[PDB]
Amino acid sequence: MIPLQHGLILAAILFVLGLTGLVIRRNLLFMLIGLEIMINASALAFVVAGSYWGQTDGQVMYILAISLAAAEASIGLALLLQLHRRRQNLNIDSVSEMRG
Amino acid sequence: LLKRDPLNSMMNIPAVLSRFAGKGLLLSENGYLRWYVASMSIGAVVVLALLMVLR
Amino acid sequence: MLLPWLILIPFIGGFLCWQTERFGVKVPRWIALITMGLTLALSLQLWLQGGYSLTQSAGIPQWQSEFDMPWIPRFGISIHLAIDGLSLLMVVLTGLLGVLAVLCSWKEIEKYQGFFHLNLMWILGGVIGVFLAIDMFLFFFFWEMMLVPMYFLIALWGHKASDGKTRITAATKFFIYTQASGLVMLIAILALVFVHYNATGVWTFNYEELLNTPMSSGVEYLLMLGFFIAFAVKMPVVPLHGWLPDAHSQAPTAGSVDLAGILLKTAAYGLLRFSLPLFPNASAEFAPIAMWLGVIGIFYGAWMAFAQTDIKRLIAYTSVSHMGFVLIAIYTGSQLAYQGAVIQMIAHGLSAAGLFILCGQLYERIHTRDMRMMGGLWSKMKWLPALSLFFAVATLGMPGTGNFVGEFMILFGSFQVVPVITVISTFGLVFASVYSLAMLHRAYFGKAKSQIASQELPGMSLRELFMILLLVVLLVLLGFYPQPILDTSHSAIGNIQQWFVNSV
Amino acid sequence: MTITPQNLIALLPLLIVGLTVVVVMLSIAWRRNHFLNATLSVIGLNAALVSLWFVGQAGAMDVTPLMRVDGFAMLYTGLVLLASLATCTFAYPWLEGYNDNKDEFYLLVLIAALGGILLANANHLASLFLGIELISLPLFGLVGYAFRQKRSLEASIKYTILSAAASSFLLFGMALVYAQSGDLSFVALGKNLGDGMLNEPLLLAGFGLMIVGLGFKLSLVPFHLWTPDVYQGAPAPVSTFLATASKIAIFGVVMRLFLYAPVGDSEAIRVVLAIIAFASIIFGNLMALSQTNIKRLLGYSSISHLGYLLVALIALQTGEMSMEAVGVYLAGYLFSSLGAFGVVSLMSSPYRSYRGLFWHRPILAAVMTVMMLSLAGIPMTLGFIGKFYVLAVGVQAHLWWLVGAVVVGSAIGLYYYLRVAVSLYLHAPPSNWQYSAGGIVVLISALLVLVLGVWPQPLISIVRLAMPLM
Numbered sequence A: 001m002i003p004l005q006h007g008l009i010l011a012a013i014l015f016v017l018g019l020t021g022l023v024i025r026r027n028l029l030f031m032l033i034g035l036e037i038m039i040n041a042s043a044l045a046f047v048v049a050g051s052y053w054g055q056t057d058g059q060v061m062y063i064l065a066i067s068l069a070a071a072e073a074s075i076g077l078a079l080l081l082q083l084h085r086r087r088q089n090l091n092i093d094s095v096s097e098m099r100g
Numbered sequence B: 001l002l003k004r005d006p007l008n009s010m011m012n013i014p015a016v017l018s019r020f021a022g023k024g025l026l027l028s029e030n031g032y033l034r035w036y037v038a039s040m041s042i043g044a045v046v047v048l049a050l051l052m053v054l055r
Numbered sequence C: 001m002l003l004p005w006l007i008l009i010p011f012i013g014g015f016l017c018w019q020t021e022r023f024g025v026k027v028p029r030w031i032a033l034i035t036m037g038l039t040l041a042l043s044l045q046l047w048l049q050g051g052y053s054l055t056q057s058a059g060i061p062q063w064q065s066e067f068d069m070p071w072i073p074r075f076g077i078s079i080h081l082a083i084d085g086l087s088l089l090m091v092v093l094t095g096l097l098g099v100l101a102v103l104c105s106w107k108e109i110e111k112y113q114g115f116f117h118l119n120l121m122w123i124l125g126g127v128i129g130v131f132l133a134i135d136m137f138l139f140f141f142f143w144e145m146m147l148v149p150m151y152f153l154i155a156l157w158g159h160k161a162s163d164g165k166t167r168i169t170a171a172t173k174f175f176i177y178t179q180a181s182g183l184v185m186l187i188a189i190l191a192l193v194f195v196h197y198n199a200t201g202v203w204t205f206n207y208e209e210l211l212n213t214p215m216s217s218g219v220e221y222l223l224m225l226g227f228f229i230a231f232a233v234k235m236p237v238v239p240l241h242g243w244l245p246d247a248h249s250q251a252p253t254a255g256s257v258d259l260a261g262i263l264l265k266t267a268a269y270g271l272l273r274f275s276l277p278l279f280p281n282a283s284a285e286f287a288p289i290a291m292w293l294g295v296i297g298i299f300y301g302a303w304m305a306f307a308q309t310d311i312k313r314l315i316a317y318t319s320v321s322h323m324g325f326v327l328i329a330i331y332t333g334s335q336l337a338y339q340g341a342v343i344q345m346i347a348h349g350l351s352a353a354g355l356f357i358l359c360g361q362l363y364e365r366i367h368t369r370d371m372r373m374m375g376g377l378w379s380k381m382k383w384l385p386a387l388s389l390f391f392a393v394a395t396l397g398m399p400g401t402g403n404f405v406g407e408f409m410i411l412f413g414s415f416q417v418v419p420v421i422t423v424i425s426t427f428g429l430v431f432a433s434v435y436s437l438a439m440l441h442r443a444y445f446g447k448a449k450s451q452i453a454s455q456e457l458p459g460m461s462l463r464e465l466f467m468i469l470l471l472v473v474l475l476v477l478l479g480f481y482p483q484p485i486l487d488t489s490h491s492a493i494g495n496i497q498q499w500f501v502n503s504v
Numbered sequence D: 001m002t003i004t005p006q007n008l009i010a011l012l013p014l015l016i017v018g019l020t021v022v023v024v025m026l027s028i029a030w031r032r033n034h035f036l037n038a039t040l041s042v043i044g045l046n047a048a049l050v051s052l053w054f055v056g057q058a059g060a061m062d063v064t065p066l067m068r069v070d071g072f073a074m075l076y077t078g079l080v081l082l083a084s085l086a087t088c089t090f091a092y093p094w095l096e097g098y099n100d101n102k103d104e105f106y107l108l109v110l111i112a113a114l115g116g117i118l119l120a121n122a123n124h125l126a127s128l129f130l131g132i133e134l135i136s137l138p139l140f141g142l143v144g145y146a147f148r149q150k151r152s153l154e155a156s157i158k159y160t161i162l163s164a165a166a167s168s169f170l171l172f173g174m175a176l177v178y179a180q181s182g183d184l185s186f187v188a189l190g191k192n193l194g195d196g197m198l199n200e201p202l203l204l205a206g207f208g209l210m211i212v213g214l215g216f217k218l219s220l221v222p223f224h225l226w227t228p229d230v231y232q233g234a235p236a237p238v239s240t241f242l243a244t245a246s247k248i249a250i251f252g253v254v255m256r257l258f259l260y261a262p263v264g265d266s267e268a269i270r271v272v273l274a275i276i277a278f279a280s281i282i283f284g285n286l287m288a289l290s291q292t293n294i295k296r297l298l299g300y301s302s303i304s305h306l307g308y309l310l311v312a313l314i315a316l317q318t319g320e321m322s323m324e325a326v327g328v329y330l331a332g333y334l335f336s337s338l339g340a341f342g343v344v345s346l347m348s349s350p351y352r353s354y355r356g357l358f359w360h361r362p363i364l365a366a367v368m369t370v371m372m373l374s375l376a377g378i379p380m381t382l383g384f385i386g387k388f389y390v391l392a393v394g395v396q397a398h399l400w401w402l403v404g405a406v407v408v409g410s411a412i413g414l415y416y417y418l419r420v421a422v423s424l425y426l427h428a429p430p431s432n433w434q435y436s437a438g439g440i441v442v443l444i445s446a447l448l449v450l451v452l453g454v455w456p457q458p459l460i461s462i463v464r465l466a467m468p469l470m
């Protein structure tokens, strides 16, 4: 009896909140956090879509989504670790040497 | 009056227009990642709004 | 039969010029000389065996020789060559100007002469392929493949006294103009081919098949406009003209690049062969705009040529004015004006070739091109000022030279069509005489206005004097006996004129 | 649908590249040997390229509820495999100077090639997503392979963050699309709509977010700002792979998605992609006017060439040779970009100014000027054949704004391509068989460009043979 539109609205709200956190934060850790929020919101939308149609495809796409989220978080945190190791800061505006 | 070839400058006007447009467009490549994400979200908003208007 | 060999002999000759540089530094000039000797011999053999004087006008198509081979059968694209009187005349002119271009750069003992010679041969082969191709994709292919060696010659082997950046800028501007115009022409060709495909259902690029294509009024105008924009860039037609003085200024000092592909008038041949038969009603509607563009081109080129302090830019603007005359001739729809246009293009090629060669010699002696740093060179040189006087009198339309014959037949046909453009063009001839006298007296008459012009200068070589006097003899014989040239191209002019006036 | 032995023999390049990944990984676990691991990776990629013959004799069929194999899949698999082979060949002399571990590079190249093959064979939203991610993440590793360098680490961070954002955008788009339709297959995206009601807002928004993700992945305006930085900062073999294989695989899956979906012929989607293609051509050509760096210049070149690709994309449902034009253009662009980035890689190898290149490296200068004439669409080059195909397809469907954009961008590209090609011959102030192998690779690339620019008929026949299912 739960409307599909309300679940899609919740997923969209979490998606745009994750995008806002991705944009307005200079710290690379908070942008990685925002990226995790966006991909988890997309997984939530896929779960809701699969649950409305009574299909396991939504949960399978959720499984692929969280596999990508885990591996992307691993790679992004490795890059953040090397950035903090050699730069001693997490300011993403400081790494802007390549321009024009 | 014509020793400076005015028609040559008239047809060279698109060249300086292209140069000015390229120099202006290269300002978007400031190298900042947050601006790149902001431009991606701007493009998402523009594409979605254009799809809703033309539907 | 001989047309593929006519196109391919320059390319094989250029490859041999590049490859035989390891045998010696004085070898590739001989290879290029025998290459254009064989090309000119084949062109004259085609002239003798074609029977062009006895050929009557039978209607488009009518080719004295024809070759066909499938090239891209998916689009119906073929290497399809065809020669007739006008194409044979321009092929002979191409061969003669290539012989002159090889002979003009005989003293270059540079360490990379093979690539210079190869680029010259590739330019000449591209010009021959333009004059021979009757397939639209092949004609466009030659039209754009002949520009890369011109770009590299202007950019790398160009005027050594000037800075490199000026040469790069001039070559890039010339390439951008010619290739953007070619791309517009390709769009027009593609749209015409798609119209024919929607009308009939067959894939073809052959110009004989595209003639009988039903087009609405306005689409035909757009296709004609694309073709005319390409030909107007390459002719040149104002305001699509500044590439010509810019490329002539930064050309190589010998002047062979000018004689190779720049001074050969492929764009007016394209206007006569492709713009008028394929789109006759559109060209009939466009004739006032094109002929007023020709009038503006004549007077603009005259005023630019009078104002130049440089000889090369001056001769380039003379070319602009004479091409304005030819552009006026093309849209008249008159047989007399068309024959005069053919004579005018051949005579203008000869006269401008002589002028550019003599300008190269004069720059070799005096090491400058500014007309304010010279003067009174009649007493300081043996042969050069008199031959330059003869050529400057030739380009002002003097009887006894073929320029007068061509311009006056043009004006006779045009006055049979429209009087006002004719009378304004004759005052343009007055302007042409004005700029020719101005160049002559700023260059060779008066007192020495510098120090290098006040010293005695060595005379011209025997080979260089031989080729200059050969040009002089050819111009005089064209002025007094233009009849074999007229009977050579009488069938093609008749076919084009009858197709233009019988379909409007 | 279950898997048959015929479905296994349709799976041949995927299985071969995966087995190569496992074998190379186990060989790295045995003993770190750069030459033997590189040889194993090249052997596996060449084995998949050979086994494409057996895939072709297997016929065109459906292997999964996800995958579809046809000649289109063979052509894009072959392009991706050739790009990966050239990437390994260019990468070995560059990796000769790398102080750290060099053996993971070929593992990442093999996994990215696996993702490219999956994207070529993709007939599903799941396969599309997994192929995009399987291309992206090894490219995250490869771009930041020289992580000690400032530029490589910066490009890796930018590419990782932006591609994670694009992956989330794309995934939310297919989530909305699946919420509308109920089936993730390509053929059912809008099949439950009729009577002119194809422009459902939720389906259009999901496809718009998918366009956002893919236009990031195809360097399309306005998701193009990453391209010059990521191209410049990454190693030159990585720049080669990112220019050729990733773009070709993603554009192939976009081709298949827009052919098969009923929503692909929507008017609003067509106008949005027309705007994107116009802006992409104009912006990519204009922003490369004043670039003194070859890598950023080639990134903007990639943007322009993908704009011409999208122009060929738009006329898919109207014209008949749109796929043939895309295939011919992509073969030519693969050859040209492989040659140009390979000469850049050979001048950047080993890991430790193009002006005056002819006076010490004449063959590489000739190869570079051949490819910069090719990318400009000059005749006697295959890029001209591709541009001619794009212009013919645009003329057929009356896409006149796109045709004018192609002409103007071609003029601007002519300017900067000729500027570099003539800066090669001005005046300015190895010794192993793998460097010679890279030189042979770029030389055969230049010879192929010249020969198929003079005689384009065999490539046209090959691409016309690669016809997907109707």
Ligand SMILES: CCCCCCCCCCCCCCCCCC(=O)OC[C@H](COP(=O)(O)OCCN)OC(=O)CCCCCCCCCCCCCCCCC
Binding pocket: B011, B012, B014, B015, B016, B018, B019, C169, C172, C173, C176, C177, C180, C181, C184, C229, C233, C240, D289, D407, D408, D411, D412, D415
């Ligand atoms: C009859 C009109 C309608 C039909 C037109 C058909 C098109 C062909 C004929 C017109 C061609 C006009 C070309 C004008 C520019 C020529 C090229 C040029 O000038 O290049 C040199 C210039 C660089 O020189 P410089 O200033 O010395 O550089 C140092 C600065 N760092 O280079 C530059 O500044 C950059 C050059 C960029 C590329 C050239 C400009 C392209 C503009 C669009 C081309 C298509 C035409 C569209 C219509 C235009 C308006 C008529």
Ligand SMILES: CCCCCCCCCCCCCCCCCC(=O)OC[C@H](COP(=O)(O)OCCN)OC(=O)CCCCCCCCCCCCCCCCC
Binding pocket: C184, C187, C188, C191, C195, C198, C214, C215, C216, C219, C222, C223, C225, C226, C229, D398, D400, D401, D403, D404, D407, D408
């Ligand atoms: C920057 C340089 C390039 C310039 C920009 C790019 C090219 C722009 C071309 C604009 C064309 C506008 C056409 C507007 C009307 C379109 C609808 C129409 O009337 O179509 C008619 C017809 C299709 O109907 P159909 O049943 O085939 O009828 C056959 C008619 N003979 O249609 C057809 O059969 C096909 C019609 C084709 C029309 C010619 C298109 C190309 C013409 C040459 C290039 C443009 C003009 C020259 C350059 C201008 C200045 C730059």
Ligand SMILES: CCCCCCCCCCCCCCCCCC(=O)OC[C@H](COP(=O)(O)OCCN)OC(=O)CCCCCCCCCCCCCCCCC
Binding pocket: B014, B017, B018, C216, C217, C218, C219, C221, C222, C225, C228, C229, C232, C237, C238, C239, C240, C293, D404, D408
């Ligand atoms: C980076 C910025 C700077 C560089 C870029 C600058 C801009 C580049 C693009 C410029 C060109 C824009 C498009 C121009 C073509 C427009 C075509 C058009 O509107 O066609 C409409 C119509 C089509 O014909 P239709 O009515 O369909 O016919 C069938 C039924 N009778 O057409 C007709 O009915 C006939 C219309 C004829 C007049 C329109 C064409 C004018 C062409 C102007 C250039 C040539 C002028 C003449 C030659 C000058 C010297 C070369």
Ligand SMILES: CCCCCCCCCCCCCCCCCCCC
Binding pocket: C089, C092, C093, C346, C474, C475, C477, C478, C481, C482, C484, C485
């Ligand atoms: C395409 C190159 C043209 C060069 C100029 C040619 C001008 C025509 C010269 C023809 C020969 C004139 C002198 C000999 C006349 C012989 C007459 C024979 C029949 C009586």
